[PDB]
Each structure stands twice: as structure tokens, then as C-alpha cells.
Amino acid sequence: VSPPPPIADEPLTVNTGIYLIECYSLDDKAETFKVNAFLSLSWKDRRLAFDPVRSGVRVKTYEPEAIWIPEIRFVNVENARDADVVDISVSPDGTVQYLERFSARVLSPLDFRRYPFDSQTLHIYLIVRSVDTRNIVLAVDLEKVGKNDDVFLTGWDIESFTAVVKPANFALEDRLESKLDYQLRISRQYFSYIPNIILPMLFILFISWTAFWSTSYEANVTLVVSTLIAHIAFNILVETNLPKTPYMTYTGAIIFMIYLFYFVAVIEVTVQHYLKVESQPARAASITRASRIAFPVVFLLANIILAFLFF
Amino acid sequence: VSPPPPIADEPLTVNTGIYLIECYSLDDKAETFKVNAFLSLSWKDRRLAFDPVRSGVRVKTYEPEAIWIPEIRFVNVENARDADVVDISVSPDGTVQYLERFSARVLSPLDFRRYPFDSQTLHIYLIVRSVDTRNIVLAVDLEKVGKNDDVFLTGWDIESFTAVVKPANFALEDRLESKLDYQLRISRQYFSYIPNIILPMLFILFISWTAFWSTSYEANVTLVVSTLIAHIAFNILVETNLPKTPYMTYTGAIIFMIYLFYFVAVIEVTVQHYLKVESQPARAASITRASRIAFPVVFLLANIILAFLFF
Amino acid sequence: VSPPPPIADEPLTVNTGIYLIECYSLDDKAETFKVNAFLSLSWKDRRLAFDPVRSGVRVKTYEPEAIWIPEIRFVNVENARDADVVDISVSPDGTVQYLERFSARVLSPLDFRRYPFDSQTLHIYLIVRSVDTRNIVLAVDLEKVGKNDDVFLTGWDIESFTAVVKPANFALEDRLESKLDYQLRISRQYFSYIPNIILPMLFILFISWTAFWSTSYEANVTLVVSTLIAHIAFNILVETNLPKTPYMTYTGAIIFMIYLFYFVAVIEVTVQHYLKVESQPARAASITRASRIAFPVVFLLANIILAFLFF
Amino acid sequence: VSPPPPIADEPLTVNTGIYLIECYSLDDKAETFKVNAFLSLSWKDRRLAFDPVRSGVRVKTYEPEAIWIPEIRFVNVENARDADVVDISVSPDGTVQYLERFSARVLSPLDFRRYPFDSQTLHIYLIVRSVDTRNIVLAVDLEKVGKNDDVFLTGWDIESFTAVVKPANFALEDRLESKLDYQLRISRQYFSYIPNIILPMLFILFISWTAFWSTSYEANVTLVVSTLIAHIAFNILVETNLPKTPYMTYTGAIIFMIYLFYFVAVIEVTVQHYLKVESQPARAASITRASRIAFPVVFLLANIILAFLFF
Amino acid sequence: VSPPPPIADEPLTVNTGIYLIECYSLDDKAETFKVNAFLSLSWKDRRLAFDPVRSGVRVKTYEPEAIWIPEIRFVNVENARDADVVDISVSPDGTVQYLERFSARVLSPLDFRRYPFDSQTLHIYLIVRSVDTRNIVLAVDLEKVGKNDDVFLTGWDIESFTAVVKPANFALEDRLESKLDYQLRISRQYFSYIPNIILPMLFILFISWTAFWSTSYEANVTLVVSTLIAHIAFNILVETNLPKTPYMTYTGAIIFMIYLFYFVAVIEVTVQHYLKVESQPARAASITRASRIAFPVVFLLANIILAFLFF
Ligand code: NI
Ligand code: NI
Ligand code: NI
Ligand code: NI
Ligand code: NI
């Protein structure tokens, strides 16, 4: 088999569509997601044209090996898609209608800068390589691009599944390549982060600040060091659900900043004890009373600055 | 091969049945379960009809490639099912009886709102796409729907395995689609959660309340902060076996609430110490004595409110 | 190909044997184990009978596709076995000798009630479904059931590999099914549990009891709360390599009970401090002296009761 | 099919090229990385030469089975590459242009000596074994060696992808072997290690040094022992993202050294208490004041020595 | 195809060789290792004899399907090897030279008794089953047994790769089997265990011994209990990289022994406090001074005894 011959000099247009059946395993660390979908393909092959009166059939069903089929591939997949041909139908004018159901593990970078209040645009790149006989170009039929209503991605809200209608045509290894960008827009369900991570982390930090209403150095050391220990258990838990980033994240910035608050609280507790031992308690009292206001105020202002820089 | 021709204009009815052989790996985090079952299919193909007197056989056995077989698929599967044809039998009137044994990893959402006292309805969606020649519709043969008595799902009680007899007929990519819903009802075995998670978590909380029978600030700080540390090691264990939900769960609500009790206990311990340093112990004594009753009472009432809202 | 015809009306007997080559990956959490073995099959097919003088051969070697072979399946496997046919030999009287080497992941429930002093009976269920032409029944040739001497299952002692000679014949979807039970008896090597889990867990508990020889409330709080923290680090470890059981395990019972001992020790430490603050030390001293005997005695008796209930 | 015959006695030159499409899963522990790329092959087969005037075609497209293709393998792969032939083009002189898209898991040792400020040279070894008819030699077509601009390896900067143009020709199992070395140079994005590991680890260490401004033995013991506990919860995190190295790593050296600082701090805290109990506080004061300068100074100088030895 | 006929009654000798290309993933817990190697086979098949003068050719090249090839298998593999035939060369006398490149996951038990100063003998068992026509026996061609110089097994030193030249011939399921033992001798690179596990574990133990230079019960309780807590984080980290054994390991013995030292240190700290409260400090002082010598001395002697028993 060889590609359909051009009537003039035009490229062969292969109309595409992806219909999502299942979306699962969005792996934040691996920056992958698994997909199960329908891939629809359509092109004109005049050599397959027939007369409906003479043949007695209005449509002709072929096996993939019997006819020419464009070699359509995905760019950003781990391995080639697991595909099963559902139907191949040829109309009298030779219009081929191809339908396959496939499953694939897709590589798609994630921007964690605004985590856990982030939105992502997952990509599925469709590609076709031109042949020596003729150039093959891809097109999107938007009416054949969609998703099942039941498509759910645990911990995410699915906004839209669309395609950038204009393909990216370029040369690769002395042959033209036609690339389509299918985009799955998702937004993170941040709800659970508030009672499970944000508030417990704030509670232990506020507990360390009770040392500003205590003159007992031994109890203060216990308060600040134990909550810092209680905080270490929380930081590690964050940096095992996310991959190693070259940039600063919203949550990473807050987590780092909270260490400074523990560090300055230890300095305050040390300074307070040192002055009282040095028979300067009136002074230690001024630093401790100022700390009661300074620590929550600086914490609030630093968080407003951070939220502003990130959002 | 082509589909059986209609006598009038009627759709081809494909009778289905699923008999569960094995149920395993209910993954709460992934919201998947693995299944090993028999899939039975039945339809009339008049082109395969025969005379029993002339043929000398009452039933004819065919290989899948020899005859037309409907392309039946599962909607909510990770990859296409691993299937092995067991038998194909044709009766004299042309009624085909197809039997295959398959294994599949099924995507089925779980509602954790009442965890660990939750019940679930797992779904297995059977689907068939109509062909150009004729429309294919699915039906349930209730006599061929069941499960092996030995079918066990570790940590769960299997209630029933039934099918919604009326299919969901709809258009998908300019063709008719007939969908059946097979439902596996299960209820969680909550027993082990009581001695392993609930009671140990309550023990450490009650230990923090012993600070209400102590005037020693340094020992009180040690009691409340250390048990809060012990509590942290328990929340992490629970959350890592469940996915991220946009709603509040029963266990998550209790776990969050217990933090407030640790936080208020620290305030009480701080207030008590502050008043005694300020030479107001009669007052500190009133707050501490009230706390002895308030903390268990508010804990009991808040749990009654939570149990009411969730059940 | 069709099944061998019956001389009278008798069912076709398929003699079976399983010879274990490798046993690996006994997964306690998943309740699975992997197996690599030989599966031998034997049956009489008179249509394959030949004269040795005329044919010039004493044995005939066939390809699986050339002759009729019974569809033998395993009941309790995750997916269908990975099998490779080794040999098919036909004797002059039509006796077929089939041999395949296979590998499979087997689902077999484990009873953890006596863990880590437990024994298990792993099962491999062989099954055959009858055909319309005739009924197929399975048989065990005990001389063809065995295991390689080098077969090792890490952390377990392999006792025996036998088969329940009488098959379980039953009707399933209007056809006879013949099921054989192959049993692999194993006993857990409990040795390492003594120095690695049991004794370290007992050491920290006995360390908490040193608080009964101390009047220092602050040191006592540190002793009991820190060892309870040390006990938490050991419980989590056990409840990860074990599934969520609807019943109570031997180790689970001991682990739960040890919490009560920590809880009562905290009450004692609190009661002791409260009485001394109330200028009643003679009384606190009586409770503390009684606790020195009561705690180890109640611990010993409760363990004797538990060992009796479980063994 | 047989290899192309030599015109004189020359070896057959197979021109190669690798174009990277995807780079993912650089597993530090396993010392592997996954690759998805184009493999281009080119050689002259005179038996396939044709006249463009007579044939009416300027290029001829063949199926892999129709013509002779060199058996090209990768040396350092876990299993054989998953390959799909994209195109086979023959020019009139018989120059074959072969193109396949493949995916493979590559074994490439990593040098962690300078971690997390390390750079690596990943290798992909191409190999061909000579046949009895003639010797096959590999060559690099630099114009067909490259990478997609979007090629990203999470946590790494991709510097270059080049090939050592001269093959390593050698005898292996009584036949000639021609080996090419494709090199992917990468440098680690160390940025995130500073706020997530380096600074938190330094904060807890500096917190232990506050004991040099305290005379309270009980608070000092709490400061140094608790931060050492906090440090233990950091060493474990690093040594589980790397394999077992026979040499010393930069990070491993720092982590080990920090233990000595905790150990000497405990000695100082013990010596200080011992002298004060022995009524020698003037002396304990001299050691404590010296420690305030000695500990940060020795820490800085030891880190300068380490940085010098490693970089 | 059928096996080569015997000239007299002798068994067919199949000469074997394994050449290691890659060694990776030595999994201590699973007791497996992955291998990528060349498997060479050689046997005489007189039916393939030819005259070099008449045929012109000195060697004949065949496709695997064209000639008879012995069914060679590996005993201790998880699944059947992934094999690709490289070459099949037939010499004038009928001597066949077969070469394949394979990859396999090998099951090989590991003796952890001397861990981390252990050496292992990994096994690769080659096997052939005799046929009805004649008996097949295996032999080792030592000239075809080896390994690539670049073969590296991370964390191990590769000593030798040899074969036990004499096969183990035995009857299995009424046929002869010929088994060869290929041995890969390796020794563990223990270096990193010293700064990463051994010394940090010793540091925390020595820190607990500072309690013998302190009269402060509350600081002593903090010293011994906190380092015991710091020790638990080091036993779990070790016993998760190794499987459960029925015997005792070197590292396991040391780890167990260190618990006794923590336990006796708590007794000493308790006895010291008890005597001082009982107005017997002269006696408490004698026990504490003796402990300063006894604890390091008994630790050294117990380690000498352990090293002697294990090495
Ligand atoms: Ni497929
Ligand atoms: Ni299958
Ligand atoms: Ni197989
Ligand atoms: Ni492929
Ligand atoms: Ni292969």
C-alpha cells in the first residue's frame, strides 16, 4: 500500500478527533497522567471509491492491513499507545472513517508555582510524518473532540478538553511533520489542604508563640523545639508529593518562611533567658512583650507579600 | 464477516451476563479494583441456522474468527480487558452462545464521606457500538449474572452483584451506543479501625487532659506538646491511604477537631501558668477545674454533632 | 478440532499434575504468591491412535494447534497463566501426554489470627469446563505432583505440596465444571520477630515502669510519654505489612493491650503527683508500691489469657 | 535475505543518528533513564538500485521484511528497545534510509561525588555484529543527531547530545562488533536543595549552639538532643534518594560531619555541668565562651576544607 | 523437525556458554538480580553435513525455524527469558553454533549472616529436557564463559563468573534433565555503612553514656530515653532493605545488643536516683563511677565476642 495520489499538488488532510473515555493517575512527581480515549481519523482515498448501484453496498468495511492508513503517533507518550481498531468505513467517494480506542501514559509538565491553588493545561500532541509521494497535514474536527460526562480526575476539576485547530507544520529529519495540540484544562481542588495541612501547620506555629507569655526558659525551649520537631514531620510530607523544582513554589515559600519564625523564636527565648540571668529582666520583658505583637504581625505581612508575589 | 441482517428493521439484541470468579485489589487511593470474571454473550444469526436431522449435530462449535461476533467493550477500564474465549455454541435456529473469561482493572469512584463506616457501589459498564448495517442493543440475562461463593474482597463484605436491566442508549461519534450498568455493592469491615486507630488516638488525647490535674507548667507543656507530636504520627498514617477529596470525610472531621482540643489545652496550660506568675492562683484554679469537665463534655457533644451530620 | 468421542457415555478423564520449580513473592498485604511450575496433562483420544508397525514410529509428537487439547484454567489467578508448551506426545493407543511450563500470580487468603506463629495452606485451583459433546472431569496423579528441593519461600518453611484427589464437580452456567485443589502447606519462621519486634517493644514498656521507683513527676511524665512515643514507632510498622482484618490478630491483641498499660501508668503518675501536691504522700506511696507488683503481674496474666485464647 | 555484497573487500558502513523526542524518569537509585527517540540508519544496497526514468519513481518505499536491514542493538539497555518502523526509503543508487521511533530504559552509571552540584554524561551505546558474508561498521551522521527543543528532564539542565564519531571496533565471540557512544550531558538543578534541605539542616544545628548561652543543664540537654533527633529526621531523607556508593559524596560528608558537631556539643554541655557541680564555674564559663566562637569557626573552616577536596 | 540421530546410542551433547553484557538491580529484599547476556549453544547435527568443495561455502547460515534447536531453559527465573537470536552457523561436519542475546530476572538466595561484610554466589541454572528419540546432556565451553569489563553491580565487587563443568543429570516427570550451574561471585562494598549507619548509631549510644557524669535524674531520663528514641529510627531503616530470616545476622545482633545497653543504662539511672532519695549517695556514686568503665568495656568485649562468632 502507498498514500492516496494528489489530484493537483495539495497535501493530504487527515481530520482528527479525540474523545476521552477515562482520565486517571495524574502523577505529580512523575508529571504523567494516563488516558483512555477514542481516536477518530478521516481522509479521502480516491483509489477506494466505488459506485453504490454496481456494488450493492452504501458503505464498505475494511481491515487495517487491506488499505492505506496514515501513521499517526503521539509525541509526548512514554511508549506507543495501546490501540484497538473499532471501525474502518469507506463511503462511495472514497472518504475513509477510522475509529480506534486507545490507552496511553502521557508526559506533560506541571507548573507547581501556585500549589495547591494551581491550574494546569495537560497536553496530548498528535503527529504525522509526510511521505516522499506527498505531504500529510493534520486537522481538528472540533465536533469530534470531547469527553464522557463521567470522566473524573481525583483531586481535580476538569474544565475543558479542546484542540489548537492550527497544526504546527515543521521539518524533522528531511521530512515535513504536522503536529496538533490537544489540551485538557484542569484546576486543583485545594479544599482538603486547609483542614489537613495549612491549619495543623499554623496550630503548631501558634503553639510555639505561647513562649512569649512564659518566663520559664526550660518550658520555652520545650515549646519551640518540640513544635519545630512537629513541623519537620510536615515539611517532608510536602516534598514527597511534588518533584524537584528549579523555581520557588507558593507552599515551599511558606514552609521555608515558617523555619525563620522558629529560628527567631529560639533567639528570643535565648535572649530573654540571658538577660534575666544577667539581672536585666525589665529589658527581657520589653523584648518578650514586643514579640507578642511582632511575631503574628510580621507573619501576616510576610504572607500578604508572598500571596501578592505568587498571585 | 458482517453483522446478521435484520428480518424487518429491528436492532440486534445482544444478551449479556457477568459471573464474578475473583475480586481483588480494591485500591482506595487509586479508586480501582481488579476483577476476574466470565462474560457471556448471546444473539441470533440466521445465516448460521442449520437443520439438526441433515447435519447430525444438535449444536455447532465455532472459532471466534469463523463467525461474526459483536465488539463488546468495558467503559471504565484502565486498559482493554485480557480475554480468553472459552466457548462458542450455535443452536439450530442460529442462536449464538458466546463465553469468555476475562480479567480487568476497573475505575470506579469511591465516596469516603462516612469512612471507615462506608458502603460502596462499584460499577462495571458494558458497551456496544452500532454498525452502519444495523443498530446493536444490549440486554441482561439475569440467569447468567452472579458470583462465586468464595469471592472475597479483603476488608469488605460483598452484599450483591446485580445489573440495571435497562441499557442507556445514546449517540457517540455519529453512531448508536448501548451501555449496561453492572453493580457490585460492598460495605467496609470497620472492626479493626477501633483497636488500631480510634482507641490509640483517644488514649493520647485523654493523656493530654491529665494536665488539668497538674500545677507543674513544665510537666504540662511536656504532656500536651508530646501527645500532639504522637497525634501527628497518626494523621499522616490515615491520610496516605485515601485520595484528595473536595469534601469533608467523617474521620477527617474528627482528626481536624482533635487539633482544636490540643490547641485549646495549650491555651489553658499557658493561661494557668500566666495567672500563677501574676499571683492570681485562685482564678487559675477555677479555669483548670472547669476544664476538667468542659474538655470531655465538649468532646462528647462535638462528636454527637459530627456523627449526626455524617450519619 | 472437537473433543474425543465417548465409547459408551462416560466423562473424559484428564489426569493432572503440578511440579513446582519456583515459589516467590509471598505478599502478606496482597494475599498473593508467585509460582513457576510444570503442568502435566493426560487423556485418551482414540482418533489419534496408530499402528507402530505401519507408521514406523512408537510415539508421535504434535503441535498444540494440530490436536484437541482440554482448556484447563486456574480459578484463583490474577490473570491467565503465562504458559509455554514443552512437549505433546501421543502413544499408539491415543494416550496424549501434555507438558507445559507456566508462571502465575495466585490469590490465596491468609489467616493472620496466630501471626507471627502462623501456618498457611496456599491453594492453586485447577478447573475444566465441559463441552456440549461431552463432560470433562479432572483427576490427580499424585506421582506427578511435587516440588524441586531448592524451592524456597523466604521467611517460610515449606511443609508439603499435595492435591485433594477428589475433584469438586458442579454446574456453572448450564455446564459441568471439574475443580481440583492443589495445596502448598507452609509455616512462618517466627525466630527474627523475638529480637527485632517482641523484645524491643517489651524493653520500652519495662522502661515506662521505672516511673514506679520515682517521685519526680516531671521525670515520670518524660518516662511514660516518651516510651509511648517509642511504642507508636513500633505499632505502625506491624500495621503496614498486614491487611485490615475483620477479626483480632495475636500480635494486634498484644499491641492494643500495651496501650492500656501506658494509659493506666499515666493515671498512676497523675494520681501520685496529685496526692503529693495535696500533702497526702503516704497514700501516693501505697499506690506506687502496689503498682510495682500489679503492672508486671497483670501484664503476665493478661498475656497468659491472650496466648490461651489464640493457641 | 542476505547482506549487500562488497564491491571490493570493504566493510559495510551503516550511518546512524539518534534524535531525542522525550527524556524522562532519571532514576538516581536505579541509575537508569528512559528515552523516546528516532533512530535513523543508512547504508548502500546495490541490489536495490533502480532507474528513475524506467520505474517512474524517484524513491521506493519498502516494508522491513522485504529487504535486508542491519541488526542494530543497544549495549546498555535493560531489555531490547520497543521499536516501530516509521519509514524505509531507497534512492536510485540503492542508498537505504531507515527510520524508526523507539523507547528504551537505559543503564548509565551516575557519579554522586559532587551531589547536589553534580553533572553527568549519560551514555547510549549503539552496536552491530558482523556477519559471515561481511563486516559491518557503524558511523555517525552528525546532521541526524539531535534533540527536540521541548526535551525536559525534571530537575536537570540538558547541555548537549553528541556522539563520539569514531566507533570502537572489537572481536566478541569470534565475530567483529562495531560500537558507537551517544552522550547526553546534563547538570543538576541544585537550587531547591538550598531552601528545602541545606538551610533547614543549618537552622536546627545553629539552634543546638544556643546551649552555649545557657547555664541550664536540663534545657541544654533538651536543646542538643532534640535537634540531633530533628537532624536524624533529615539524614534518612537524603540517603534514600541515592544508591549505595563505595566512595564518599559531598552531601554525605557534610551530613556525617554535622554528627560530630552534635557529639562535641553534648561533651561541652556535660563538661560545663560537671565543672559547675564540682564548684569550678569560672572554668566552665571559659569553655562555654570559647565554644561560642570555636563551633561556628570550626564549622566554617571544615566546610571550606570539604568544598576544596570535592570541587 | 526432529533431534539429530545417534551414531551408536550416545546422548547428544549441547555445549553452552554465557557471556555477561549487563548486571543490574540486585534486589536484597526480593533476592533477585537482572541479567543481560549472550547465550551460546553448540551441537553436532550430521543431517546438516556438507562438502565445502561441492557447496563452495565453508559455513552455512540458517534461520531458527529451518533447523532443529534444543529447547534450553533457565531454572531459577521469574518468567521465561526475553531472547533474540543473533546467529546460527553450521560447519561442514554438521557442528551448529547458535548465539542469542537474552535478558532475565533471576531468583538467587542471599546469605545475610555477615551483612554488610557479606559475599554471595549468585546462580544461573541452565537446563535441557531429553526427548523420546534421544537423551540430551549439557556441557560447558569455558572459552565461551565470561563477562564484559564494564559489567558493574552498584554496591558490589564482581569477583568471578564461572560454571560448574559437570552437569546434574536427573529424572523429572519420566524424562532425563541435564542441569548446569553458572556462578557469579560477588562481595559487598561495606565502606558507606561506616559513616552512614555504624558511626551515627554509635554516637547516639555514647551520648546516652554522658548520664554517668550527671547527678540530675530529670536530665539523665532525657538523655537515655531520647537517644533510645533516636535509635528506633535507625533499626527500622536497616530491617526494610533486607528480608525476614530464620537465623541471626551480624548487624541484627549488634542492633539487638544496643537495646540491652539502653535498658541497663535506664536501670542504672533509676538505681542512682532511688539511692540518693533514700539518703545513700556514697553508694549511688560507686555504681555511677563503675558504670563509666563497665558500659564501654562490656560494649567492646561483647562486640569482640560477636565478631568472633560471625567471622
Ligand atoms: Ni491492543
Ligand atoms: Ni489473553
Ligand atoms: Ni508464554
Ligand atoms: Ni513496538
Ligand atoms: Ni525478544
Swiss-Prot record, chains A, B, C, D, E:
The keyword DNA-binding does not apply. Residues 1-189, 241-248 are periplasmic. Changing residue 251 to A: Marked gain of function, with a ten-fold shift of the proton dose-response curve towards lower concentrations. Also shows slower apparent rate constants for activation and deactivation. Keywords: Cell inner membrane, Cell membrane, Ion channel, Ion transport, Ligand-gated ion channel, Membrane, Potassium, Potassium channel, Potassium transport, Receptor, Signal, Sodium, Sodium channel, Sodium transport, Transmembrane, Transmembrane helix, Transport. SUPFAM superfamilies: Neurotransmitter-gated ion-channel transmembrane pore (SSF90112), Nicotinic receptor ligand binding domain-like (SSF63712). One of its GO terms (molecular function) is potassium channel activity. Its main location: membrane. InterPro entries: GABAA/Glycine_rcpt, Neur_chan_lig-bd, Neur_chan_lig-bd_sf, Neur_channel, Neuro-gated_channel_TM_sf, Neuro_actylchol_rec. It is a multi-pass membrane protein. It holds the Pfam family Neur_chan_LBD. CDD domains: LGIC_TM_bact. It is found in: Cell inner membrane. Changing residue 198 to Y: Marked gain of function, with a ten-fold shift of the proton dose-response curve towards lower concentrations. Residues 213-215, 278-280 are cytoplasmic. Tetraethylammonium (TEA) and tetrabutylammonium (TBA) inhibit the proton-activated currents in a dose- and voltage-dependent manner in vitro, whereas the blocker of acid sensing ion channels, amiloride, has no effect. Channel current of GLIC can be inhibited by inhaled and intravenous general anesthetics at and below concentrations used clinically. Ion conduction is also inhibited by lidocaine and by divalent transition metal ions such as cadmium ions. The chain crosses the membrane at residues 190-212, 216-240, 249-277, 281-311. Gene3D superfamilies: Neurotransmitter-gated ion-channel ligand-binding domain (2.70.170.10), Neurotransmitter-gated ion-channel transmembrane domain (1.20.58.390). Consists of an N-terminal ligand-binding domain that encloses a wide aqueous vestibule and a transmembrane domain that forms a narrow channel. Cationic channel with similar permeabilities for Na(+) and K(+), that is activated by an increase of the proton concentration on the extracellular side. Displays no permeability for chloride ions. Shows slow kinetics of activation, no desensitization and a single channel conductance of 8 pS. Might contribute to adaptation to external pH change. The homologous nature of GLIC to eukaryotic nicotinic acetylcholine receptors and other eukaryotic pentameric ligand-gated ion channels, and its sensitivity to general anesthetics, define GLIC as a structural and functional model of signal transduction in the nervous system, also relevant for exploring the molecular basis of anesthetic action. Belongs to the ligand-gated ion channel (TC 1.A.9) family. Homopentamer. This is Proton-gated ion channel.
